[PDB]
Ligand binder design. Structure first.
Ligand code: FES
Ligand SMILES: [Mg+2]
Lengths: 96, 99, 122, 137, 109, 85
RNA sequence: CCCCACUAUGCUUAGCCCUAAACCUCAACAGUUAAUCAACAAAACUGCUCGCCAGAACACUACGAGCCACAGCUUAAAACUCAAA
RNA sequence: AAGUGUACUGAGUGCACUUGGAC
């Protein structure tokens, strides 16, 4: 009929979802070097999702991994282990 | 052989431009208030930029300027609002004077 | 199914540790487990002091006995590890590789909070 | 080298020293700051009691104990005792939230002991004893 | 009234403890506010917290503004702590009684 | 059963014990330990805790929305560009 | 009412009692957004089924009955009174 | 602060629950 009729199609300009830094990467309860990144250096308190910038699934996975490591003796409970202080800062925190 | 409205929309430069995020356009100053420059850029709304600290005097009515558009219309939904509130002005970054 | 036994052993000499690991694998086989593989994460200072068998230790050797066993064998394995003295601490978990890595497209968009306030004409 | 606020790693070759003594070796000045008392104990790295002080010891009685001046006097007395014992530097570790929490350190410094590290050890129970119900006036 | 006096004492202690930390706000904590006293209205309609003023006028104004902005949050923190089951609105009042003594001693010197 | 002095320890810089203590207290407040201590001085019944948490979440979201709205509409405060009309 | 100490009790086991503002005070299922509607509350409705109510108080009461194993719960009235509730 | 259930005591208290309250 008329070739200029707008067509029914999905958005091509839509951008892919912002994958969380851990999305598609398997969290493990033995990767203390990783879990340390998501706990408070001075107290060992687990950072909330509003600080870790992680989706619900991976936030829960990190929480469970941290608890499992702590109870099984892989991770200190009351502090980020000093060996991992130089690791990249992946939590939006402004102590200083 | 008169182009239809659909054809005009299809071939409109504004349609040609995709999403208006970070796009570069050549806007035009059309109203200046002290340090506020009201720049129209062919869109529905205008952007209210501020006079850059460098070459401020060069910014005068009718001056063609470069803009990085962030949003054609500044709108948002507030708590419990039944419709989006719009501030009736685009959001763009003044990159300087086009020559 | 496929289990992983994380084992923290009292830090001590090579012949001693080999004997303890052999005894543990013997216990697993008696309990019917098909020991898959043995891994060693080395010795290191325990994150916090752990007491066991009228004693406390600060350094331990970490190992991961991956195996398969009938479900019933797990309780017996737990009891055996608890009774053993050379084991600072033994835990048994469902082997992580068993769980499938369900793929997430990414972070889904966050709309306005779900009906946290009324919609009446107010 | 740029300064750092984390404590030195025990069992690590840290060039930091104080009169040649290593951080772990420095005596420890426990400070318990309860609601109605403040107690200080400077103890050797082997936790040998080197000096002890409190508001009760300094004579402040009942309410007067919960005062910054009382805490300062306790700190000064403990500092004098520790100095007589031969102490110079001290690692301050504090628990509780008594009013003299800072005045105790103030008095200790005024008495002349160099605080090299301020540490907290507040007994925060993850979940244990159920606390008593709330007062009402 | 003895009950009112006890309430004033408890509220003074609680407010001092609150201000000891950034709990209310880092901005408030940095100001290092010192409370002169606490007085409860006879009907329990308000709680006036008399805070000592400093010499700097701009500092006094800024401290007053921050205290007024944080009074409601402090009230909520108290009622949450259960230091008092019900706390009336908190009003921060400047205290300047010590100025007379200070300037006396200055002149007398 | 942990190592001592590694948790909640701040090294004083050049002896400004006041500054170091302020930093430590800031750390405690940021991690919420002070909240926990002062709330655990007494026992909040589960019903009260639930009500308080719901109220806190509602107030947090309301404040966030109000601040966002204020920031969004602040731009219009610019001097009137059509004065005299 | 505040402070101190302490008991039932909160806990484990094995049995009982069956009541809560047991509440999202909004029954299950299916469906709709077409024309809004006492008021407030959680926008308004349609179909379909079960349960429940027929002014207030007497009355979470009495009698009987069931569970009890005797001090209690469930079921649950009547008379008299009023033009209110 | 109010109230529901429950138990002791002689209106309060104890435990849990609801906002049919305030922040
Ligand atoms: S965003 Fe995909 S797993 Fe976290
Ligand atoms: Mg008992």
């Amino acid at each position: 009929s008329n070739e200029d009729l707008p067509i029914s199609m999905e958005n091509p300009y839509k951008e892919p979802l912002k994958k969380c830094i851990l999305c598609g990467k398997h969290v493990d309860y033995k990767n203390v070097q990783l879990l340390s990144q998501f706990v408070s250096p001075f107290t060992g308190c687990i950072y909330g999702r509003h600080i870790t910038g992680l989706c619900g699934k991976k936030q829960k996975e990190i929480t469970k991994a941290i608890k499992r490591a702590q109870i099984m003796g892989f991770m200190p409970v009351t502090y980020k282990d000093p060996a991992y202080l130089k690791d990249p800062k992946v939590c939006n925190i402004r102590y200083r | 052989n008169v182009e239809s409205f659909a054809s005009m929309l299809r071939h409109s430069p504004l349609t040609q431009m995709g999403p208006a995020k970070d796009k570069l356009v050549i806007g035009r100053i059309f109203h200046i208030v002290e340090n506020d420059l009201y720049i129209d850029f062919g869109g529905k709304f205008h952007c209210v930029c501020r006079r850059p600290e460098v070459d401020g005097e060069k910014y005068q009515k009718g001056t063609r300027v470069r803009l990085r558009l962030l949003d054609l219309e500044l709108t948002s939904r507030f708590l419990g609002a039944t419709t989006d509130t719009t501030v009736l002005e685009a959001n763009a970054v003044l990159l300087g004077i086009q020559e | 199914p496929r289990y992983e036994l994380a084992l923290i052993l009292k830090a001590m000499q090579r012949p001693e540790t080999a004997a303890t690991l052999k005894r543990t694998i013997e216990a697993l086989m008696d309990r019917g487990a098909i020991v898959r593989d043995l891994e060693n994460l080395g010795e290191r200072a325990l994150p916090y002091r752990i007491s066991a068998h009228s004693q406390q230790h600060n350094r331990g050797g970490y190992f991961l006995v991956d195996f398969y066993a009938p479900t019933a064998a797990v309780e017996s394995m737990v009891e055996h590890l608890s009774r053993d003295i050379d084991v600072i601490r033994g835990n048994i978990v469902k082997h992580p590789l068993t769980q499938e890595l369900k793929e997430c497209e990414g972070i889904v968009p966050v709309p306005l909070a779900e009906k946290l306030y009324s919609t009446k004409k107010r | 080298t740029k300064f750092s606020i984390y404590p030195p790693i025990p069992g690590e070759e840290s060039s930091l020293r104080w009169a040649g003594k290593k951080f772990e070796e420095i005596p420890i000045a426990h400070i318990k700051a309860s609601h109605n008392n403040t107690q200080i104990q400077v103890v050797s790295a082997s936790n040998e009691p080197l000096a002890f002080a409190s508001c009760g010891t300094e004579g402040f009685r009942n309410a007067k104990k919960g005062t910054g001046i009382a805490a300062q006097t306790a700190g000064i007395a403990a500092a004098a005792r520790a100095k007589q014992k031969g102490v110079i530097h001290i690692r301050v570790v504090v628990k509780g939230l008594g009013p003299g929490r800072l005045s105790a350190m103030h008095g200790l410094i005024m008495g002349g002991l160099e605080v090299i590290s301020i540490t907290d050890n507040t007994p925060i129970p993850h979940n244990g004893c159920r606390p008593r119900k709330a007062r009402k006036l | 009234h003895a009950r009112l006096r006890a309430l004033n004492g408890l509220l003074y202690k609680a407010l001092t403890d609150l201000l000891c930390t950034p709990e209310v706000s880092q901005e408030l904590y940095d100001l290092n506010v010192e409370l002169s006293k606490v007085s409860l209205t006879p009907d329990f309609s308000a709680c006036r917290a008399y805070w000592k003023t400093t010499l700097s006028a701009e500092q006094n104004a800024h401290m007053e503004a921050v205290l007024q902005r944080s009074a409601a949050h402090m009230r909520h923190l108290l009622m949450s702590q259960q230091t008092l089951r019900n706390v009336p609105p908190i009003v921060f009042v400047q205290d300047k009684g010590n100025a007379a003594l200070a300037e006396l001693d200055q002149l007398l010197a | 059963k942990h190592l001592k002095f590694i948790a909640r320890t701040v090294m004083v810089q050049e002896g400004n014990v006041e500054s170091a203590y302020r930093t430590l207290n800031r750390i405690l407040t940021m991690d919420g330990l002070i909240e926990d201590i002062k709330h655990r001085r007494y026992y909040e019944k589960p019903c009260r805790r639930r009500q308080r948490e719901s109220y806190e979440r509602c107030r947090r979201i309301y404040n966030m929305e109000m601040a966002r709205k204020i920031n969004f509409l602040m731009r219009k405060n610019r001097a009137d560009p059509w004065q005299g009309c």
